[PDB]
Amino acid sequence: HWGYGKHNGPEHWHKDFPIAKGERQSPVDIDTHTAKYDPSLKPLSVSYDQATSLRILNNGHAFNVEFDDSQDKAVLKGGPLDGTYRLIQFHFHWGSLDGQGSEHTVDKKKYAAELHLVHWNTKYGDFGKAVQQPDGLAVLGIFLKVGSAKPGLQKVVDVLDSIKTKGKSADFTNFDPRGLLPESLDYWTYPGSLTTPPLLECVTWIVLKEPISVSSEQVLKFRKLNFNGEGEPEELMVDNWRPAQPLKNRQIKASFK
Ligand SMILES: [Zn+2]
């Protein structure tokens, strides 16, 4: 149904998913002049040494790099979080041009793309149970700007030809998500939602302050993916981002001074 076209884009989602107009929707604009340092946040802990990637899938909206989440292999803990959150997948949002593509914004600045590492709270047993809880998910968001290449992204870029169209997948084992992280783990955090239907308000967002750089050639390969299925008219997979939503009765907290 839903997508990012003219006729089915974000501004339409509310008809089928009324929480689209909810109290804790994502993404948001992060105003660096109102987010406040919070000395209570605990250090953040990204433990990806035992991550087992399995497959990469074009779902018609983005591509997901999927992990084995049936044990505590790759987990996020610390920061704002209580307990342990297991990595299930990562995906990106990106633009048709370098001046747009991110979902979150920083002082209204749009980055070229945004990476989402999605993790679910083990206290709820499965992903599908977790998304029904306000503290069910933790999403680590990382901005991408265009400049030098990101070596740890190339293995992703190089498999994209094999998943050009909706419904295609490829084996994608032994990929190390640590190669997608910036140097610093300074972050902003707030409570919000999934940014695609069903838009559930189940996410603790953790948005890193430092972007990673990718090359123009890397991003150009993202933009050659298709929203459509095999043999259908080509619709390039670009501009698969939701714009900023109202902050409402939320505060964005900073991990850093
Ligand atoms: Zn996302």
Curated annotation (Swiss-Prot):
EC number, as in UniProt: 4.2.1.1, 4.2.1.69
GO MF term (any one): arylesterase activity
Outcome of mutating residue 118 to K/R: Strongly reduced CO(2) hydrase and p-nitrophenyl acetate esterase activities
One GO biological process term: secretion
Documented effect of changing residue 194 to A: Reduced CO(2) hydrase activity
pH-activity profile: Optimum pH is 6-8.
Note: Target of drugs used in treatments against glaucoma disorder and breast cancer.
Subunit annotation: Interacts with SLC4A4. Interaction with SLC4A7 regulates SLC4A7 transporter activity. Interacts with SLC26A6 isoform 4 (via C-terminus cytoplasmic domain).
Protein name (database record): Carbonic anhydrase 2
Originating species: Homo sapiens (Human)
Taxonomic path: Eukaryota, Metazoa, Chordata, Craniata, Vertebrata
Gene, per the UniProt record: CA2
